[PDB]
Amino acid sequence: NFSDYFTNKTLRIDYLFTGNADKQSICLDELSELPVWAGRRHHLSELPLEGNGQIVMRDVASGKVIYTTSFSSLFQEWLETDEAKEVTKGFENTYLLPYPIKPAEVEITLRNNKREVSANLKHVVKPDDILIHKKGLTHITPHKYLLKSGNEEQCIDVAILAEGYTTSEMETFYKDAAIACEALFSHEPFQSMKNRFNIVAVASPSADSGVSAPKQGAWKHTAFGSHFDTFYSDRYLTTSRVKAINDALAGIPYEHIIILANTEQYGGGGIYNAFTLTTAHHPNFRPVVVHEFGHSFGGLADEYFYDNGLYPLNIEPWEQNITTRINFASKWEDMLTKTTPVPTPVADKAKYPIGVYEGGGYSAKGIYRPAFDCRMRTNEYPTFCPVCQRAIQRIIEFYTGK
Amino acid sequence: NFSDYFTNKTLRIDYLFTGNADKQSICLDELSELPVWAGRRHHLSELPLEGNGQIVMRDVASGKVIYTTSFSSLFQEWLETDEAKEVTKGFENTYLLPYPIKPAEVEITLRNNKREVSANLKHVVKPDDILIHKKGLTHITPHKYLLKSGNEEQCIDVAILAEGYTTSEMETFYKDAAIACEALFSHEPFQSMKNRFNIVAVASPSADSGVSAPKQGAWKHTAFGSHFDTFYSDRYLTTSRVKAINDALAGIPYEHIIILANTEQYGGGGIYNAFTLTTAHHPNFRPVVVHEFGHSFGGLADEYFYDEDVMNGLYPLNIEPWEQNITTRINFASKWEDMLTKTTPVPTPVADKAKYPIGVYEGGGYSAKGIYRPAFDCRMRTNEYPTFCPVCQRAIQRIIEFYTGK
Ligand SMILES: [K+]
Ligand SMILES: [K+]
Ligand SMILES: [Zn+2]
Ligand SMILES: [Zn+2]
Ligand SMILES: [Zn+2]
Ligand SMILES: [Zn+2]
């Protein structure tokens, strides 16, 4: 099947998402070619999760769907901030597609939290277009495999990138990458699925040590320009230099990205099929990086809650570890016992390792999570809950087989 | 007074221009602070040329216009190509403004080739906003002054950047930069106005030697990702990495950018108040770099016309171009009518060329008919002719005087 439509290369597409809270738009930045296809070769027309946006590639001749994938984005977060009620802003976003033999139509769609299409772009890619930038042939960033279970066609390729490390302190970065990798494969189900993964540490250099702190007026020259005070939230570390992130990796096989920042301050986050970014020298580095990978690889939701609006109570979330009980049969109903009370009182929690516990996806009321505590709820707790474990296991099997 | 409203710093604003042939929009990308204001300190509310887009800065308190500038853009040329009927694309663009003391409203407007508004963005810049990225303090790209006629507040600052030169090739770059400076100041009016200019050469390194040649499938890792075949025109050498060009220059006072490409392949490009790009090692390096600076500094139009060219049709025949060296005879009184002798026929027959160094010659602006140029030949039409025509010279002189006074 795969070779009916694709060569063993990557069509990398860089998009800009732009707009404000009332109107959003997608445009094309650049088309690139990478030397191998590291993604999947089966289930090419299906998705593992809905995401908040989707890309669908169709063969122009037949109209068949030949590849699809889904994601979330930082842009869709910025859309909730107060700056989005005032000015129109733009964000870089990058997707890897298998490289087609014949012309292919690519359609990318963003959805809002009511699941309405908020932006859409359909465009034809001609595989012999001379303006497709060929990348990853020379000057490949120095890197080392931490775990090499197989070739990139059969294993899930995870790249760990360096932010705020100079060339002359990569020893520290490779140590931090190993710690992150060890933390990840001490959690089930990653632990028993360890031979499905390749982990490569990529020593992308920065001119300065550390990351930028705008509030202190301390701006640094780093590989990806990460900075605190994102959206004027003091503690929120991000980078928006997505083209620079992917250029650092060109020529190295990769499907998922973890970025490690050389700093002890708390900060970071993960976004489904975008990347994880986290600080490597904070005391909670080990549980936090795994929690972020739960978002960025697992597509899981946050299970903690306050006393909101992101998850409308009349829609079933696409994330697998929270429910509004609108279509609970598609979630973890089948993992409950025939008598588990719905909702599950915290008094009887010892009785119900899996239940339907009120509180999750930031709301105390109307959203429910699968267990009382979980890596997706708190750093102190030692494991993913059984529902998150099944969710992650299903992602792994979608890409590497039962 | 300038210091009524501005400090001696630069507010750099990066925008994204996005759209297709049907619809366009502007969004803000990033605000930056550079350590000195290298631009003008008088005529702050007037424009030397209309351009295809305008920026207007207003004090929020009083509504008063405190700075303005204009430009063209690669995006606005792209909009006239066939690709813009098939996809929506986005482009980086950077503008330097004086850094305000008190909050200011910035209005950026794009106009189409009928000189009507096609996109608009207004936004407020607060001078104490913490996400204004402070640049130009450390890691300043290595550089050498080739000409230093005065400080950056008195003179026009031109930066020449290196593209496709590795660290080991920078002696060659500095030699090429000196050839370009020499070529520039061998054309009038630059020659006589040389003491109004500072020229700095900036040794920005590339990992690979040479530049990308897409038609030949040979891509190169360079500082600014320049490439031939822009809009599928073989000789059109440009970059879309406008943030990277301006980042390389952070901390060096500049107003205009010339980029030298380490290549023998023929090509160049020039866009008003954005940048010039040129091949450094082709035999026509000297006339080309000056030709492209005619676009990027002078805002001049091309005076040539080819049958099979990507740019044909950029100028509608019922609109007077804003560029000073072509006319459609829609508002010729604003152009060079006041330099014609009273008996010059309009249009001027090519047979009578000997008799009229200045006339109204049919052919220019990428159209054989309906657009007219001021002289039979000019730097803006061919590489073999030696000088700018007299209308181009006056146009350039007026730009120099706008910035540095009569
Ligand atoms: K793989
Ligand atoms: K100046
Ligand atoms: Zn989280
Ligand atoms: Zn869980
Ligand atoms: Zn030209
Ligand atoms: Zn001329």
Coordinates of C-alpha atoms in Angstrom, one line a residue, chain B residues 150-393:
Chain B
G150 CA 29.7 60.9 9.8
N151 CA 27.7 59.5 12.7
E152 CA 24.6 57.5 12.1
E153 CA 22.3 60.5 12.9
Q154 CA 23.8 62.7 10.2
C155 CA 24.4 60.2 7.3
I156 CA 22.6 57.5 5.4
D157 CA 23.6 54.1 6.8
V158 CA 23.9 51.2 4.3
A159 CA 24.8 47.7 5.5
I160 CA 26.2 45.2 3.1
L161 CA 25.7 41.6 4.2
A162 CA 27.4 38.3 3.2
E163 CA 25.3 35.5 1.7
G164 CA 26.9 32.2 0.8
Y165 CA 30.3 33.0 2.2
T166 CA 31.8 30.7 4.8
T167 CA 34.1 31.9 7.6
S168 CA 37.1 31.0 5.4
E169 CA 35.9 33.2 2.5
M170 CA 35.3 36.5 4.3
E171 CA 38.4 38.2 2.8
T172 CA 36.7 37.6 -0.5
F173 CA 33.5 39.0 0.9
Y174 CA 35.2 42.2 2.1
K175 CA 36.8 42.7 -1.3
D176 CA 33.4 42.2 -3.1
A177 CA 31.8 44.7 -0.7
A178 CA 34.4 47.2 -1.7
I179 CA 33.8 46.6 -5.4
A180 CA 30.1 47.2 -4.7
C181 CA 30.7 50.4 -2.8
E182 CA 33.0 51.6 -5.6
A183 CA 30.4 50.8 -8.2
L184 CA 27.7 52.7 -6.3
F185 CA 29.9 55.9 -5.9
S186 CA 30.8 55.8 -9.6
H187 CA 27.2 56.7 -10.6
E188 CA 25.8 60.2 -10.1
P189 CA 24.3 61.4 -8.0
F190 CA 25.9 59.0 -5.5
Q191 CA 29.3 60.1 -6.7
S192 CA 28.9 63.8 -5.7
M193 CA 26.9 62.9 -2.6
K194 CA 29.4 60.4 -1.2
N195 CA 29.9 62.3 2.0
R196 CA 26.3 61.7 3.0
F197 CA 26.8 57.9 3.3
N198 CA 28.1 55.4 5.8
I199 CA 28.8 52.0 4.3
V200 CA 29.3 49.0 6.7
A201 CA 30.2 45.5 5.5
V202 CA 28.9 42.7 7.8
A203 CA 30.5 39.3 7.6
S204 CA 27.5 37.1 8.4
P205 CA 28.7 33.5 7.8
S206 CA 27.1 30.6 6.0
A207 CA 27.7 26.9 6.5
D208 CA 27.8 26.3 2.8
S209 CA 29.6 28.2 0.0
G210 CA 27.3 29.5 -2.7
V211 CA 23.5 30.0 -2.8
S212 CA 20.5 27.7 -3.6
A213 CA 19.7 27.1 -7.3
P214 CA 16.3 25.5 -7.3
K215 CA 15.9 24.9 -11.0
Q216 CA 19.1 22.8 -10.8
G217 CA 18.0 21.0 -7.6
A218 CA 21.1 22.3 -5.7
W219 CA 20.2 23.7 -2.3
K220 CA 22.6 25.2 0.1
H221 CA 22.7 25.9 3.8
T222 CA 23.3 29.6 3.9
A223 CA 22.7 32.5 6.4
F224 CA 19.5 33.8 4.8
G225 CA 18.2 31.1 2.5
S226 CA 18.5 33.2 -0.7
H227 CA 17.7 31.4 -3.9
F228 CA 17.3 32.0 -7.6
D229 CA 14.1 31.2 -9.5
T230 CA 11.9 33.4 -7.3
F231 CA 8.3 33.2 -8.7
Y232 CA 9.8 30.8 -11.3
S233 CA 11.8 33.6 -12.8
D234 CA 15.4 32.3 -13.2
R235 CA 17.2 35.6 -12.6
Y236 CA 15.1 36.7 -9.6
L237 CA 17.4 36.2 -6.6
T238 CA 15.6 36.9 -3.3
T239 CA 15.2 35.7 0.3
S240 CA 12.1 35.3 2.4
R241 CA 14.2 35.1 5.6
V242 CA 13.7 38.8 6.4
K243 CA 13.8 38.4 10.2
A244 CA 17.2 36.7 9.8
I245 CA 18.6 39.5 7.7
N246 CA 17.6 42.1 10.3
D247 CA 18.8 39.9 13.2
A248 CA 22.3 39.7 11.6
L249 CA 22.4 43.5 11.6
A250 CA 21.2 44.0 15.2
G251 CA 23.5 46.4 17.0
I252 CA 25.0 47.9 13.8
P253 CA 23.3 51.2 12.8
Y254 CA 21.5 50.7 9.5
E255 CA 18.8 52.1 7.2
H256 CA 19.3 50.1 4.0
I257 CA 20.4 46.6 3.2
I258 CA 22.5 45.2 0.3
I259 CA 23.1 41.4 0.3
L260 CA 26.0 40.0 -1.7
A261 CA 25.7 36.4 -2.9
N262 CA 28.9 34.4 -3.3
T263 CA 28.0 33.1 -6.8
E264 CA 28.7 33.5 -10.5
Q265 CA 25.1 32.8 -11.5
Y266 CA 23.3 35.8 -12.9
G267 CA 20.7 37.3 -10.7
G268 CA 19.5 39.9 -8.4
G269 CA 16.6 41.6 -6.7
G270 CA 15.6 44.9 -5.2
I271 CA 12.5 45.9 -3.2
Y272 CA 11.9 49.4 -2.0
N273 CA 12.9 49.8 1.6
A274 CA 13.3 46.1 2.1
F275 CA 16.6 44.9 0.6
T276 CA 18.8 44.5 -2.4
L277 CA 20.3 41.1 -3.4
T278 CA 23.0 40.6 -6.0
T279 CA 25.4 38.0 -7.4
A280 CA 28.9 39.1 -6.5
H281 CA 31.0 37.3 -9.1
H282 CA 29.1 37.6 -12.4
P283 CA 30.7 40.0 -14.9
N284 CA 27.8 42.4 -14.6
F285 CA 28.1 42.6 -10.8
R286 CA 28.8 46.3 -10.8
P287 CA 25.7 47.5 -12.9
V288 CA 23.4 44.9 -11.3
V289 CA 24.1 45.9 -7.7
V290 CA 23.5 49.5 -8.6
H291 CA 20.4 48.7 -10.5
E292 CA 18.9 46.8 -7.6
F293 CA 19.8 49.6 -5.2
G294 CA 17.9 51.9 -7.6
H295 CA 14.9 49.7 -6.6
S296 CA 15.6 49.3 -2.9
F297 CA 16.9 52.8 -2.1
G298 CA 15.6 54.9 -4.9
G299 CA 12.2 53.3 -5.3
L300 CA 12.7 53.4 -9.1
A301 CA 10.8 51.2 -11.5
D302 CA 12.3 48.9 -14.2
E303 CA 12.5 50.7 -17.6
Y304 CA 12.8 47.4 -19.6
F305 CA 10.0 45.4 -21.3
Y306 CA 10.3 41.7 -22.2
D307 CA 7.7 39.5 -23.9
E308 CA 7.9 36.5 -21.7
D309 CA 8.4 37.8 -18.2
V310 CA 6.7 37.0 -14.8
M311 CA 6.3 40.7 -13.9
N312 CA 4.3 41.7 -17.0
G313 CA 1.1 43.5 -16.1
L314 CA 2.1 44.9 -12.7
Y315 CA 1.1 48.4 -13.8
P316 CA -2.5 49.1 -14.9
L317 CA -2.5 51.6 -17.8
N318 CA -5.2 53.8 -16.3
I319 CA -3.3 54.5 -13.0
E320 CA -0.3 56.7 -12.7
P321 CA 2.6 54.7 -11.1
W322 CA 3.9 56.1 -7.8
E323 CA 7.4 55.3 -9.1
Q324 CA 9.1 58.4 -10.5
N325 CA 10.8 57.1 -13.7
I326 CA 7.8 55.6 -15.6
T327 CA 4.5 57.1 -16.5
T328 CA 1.2 56.0 -18.0
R329 CA 0.4 59.7 -19.0
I330 CA -2.4 59.7 -16.4
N331 CA -0.8 62.3 -14.2
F332 CA 2.4 63.2 -16.1
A333 CA 2.6 66.6 -14.5
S334 CA 3.7 65.0 -11.2
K335 CA 6.6 63.2 -13.0
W336 CA 9.2 64.7 -15.3
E337 CA 7.2 67.0 -17.6
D338 CA 9.0 69.9 -15.9
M339 CA 12.4 68.5 -17.3
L340 CA 11.3 68.3 -20.9
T341 CA 12.1 71.1 -23.3
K342 CA 9.0 72.9 -24.6
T343 CA 9.2 71.4 -28.1
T344 CA 9.8 67.8 -27.1
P345 CA 7.1 65.6 -28.8
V346 CA 5.1 63.4 -26.4
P347 CA 5.4 60.5 -27.1
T348 CA 9.0 60.9 -28.4
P349 CA 9.8 58.8 -31.5
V350 CA 12.8 56.6 -31.3
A351 CA 14.1 58.0 -34.6
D352 CA 14.4 61.4 -32.9
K353 CA 16.4 60.0 -29.9
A354 CA 19.6 61.9 -30.7
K355 CA 17.6 65.1 -30.3
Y356 CA 16.0 64.5 -26.9
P357 CA 18.1 63.0 -24.1
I358 CA 15.0 63.4 -22.0
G359 CA 11.7 62.5 -23.5
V360 CA 8.7 60.2 -23.2
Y361 CA 9.7 57.0 -24.8
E362 CA 7.3 54.2 -25.1
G363 CA 8.2 51.0 -23.4
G364 CA 8.9 50.4 -19.7
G365 CA 7.6 48.9 -16.5
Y366 CA 7.4 45.4 -18.2
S367 CA 5.0 46.6 -20.9
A368 CA 5.9 47.3 -24.6
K369 CA 3.0 49.7 -24.9
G370 CA 1.2 52.2 -22.7
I371 CA 4.0 52.8 -20.3
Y372 CA 6.8 55.3 -21.0
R373 CA 10.3 55.9 -19.7
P374 CA 12.3 59.2 -19.6
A375 CA 15.2 58.3 -21.9
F376 CA 16.1 55.8 -24.6
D377 CA 18.5 54.0 -22.2
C378 CA 19.3 53.9 -18.5
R379 CA 20.8 51.8 -15.7
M380 CA 17.2 50.9 -14.9
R381 CA 16.7 49.4 -18.4
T382 CA 20.1 47.7 -19.4
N383 CA 23.3 46.5 -17.8
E384 CA 25.5 47.9 -20.6
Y385 CA 24.6 51.6 -20.4
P386 CA 26.9 53.5 -18.1
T387 CA 24.6 55.8 -16.1
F388 CA 21.3 56.5 -14.6
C389 CA 19.1 58.7 -16.8
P390 CA 18.6 62.3 -15.8
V391 CA 15.1 61.7 -14.3
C392 CA 16.4 58.7 -12.3
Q393 CA 19.3 61.0 -11.1

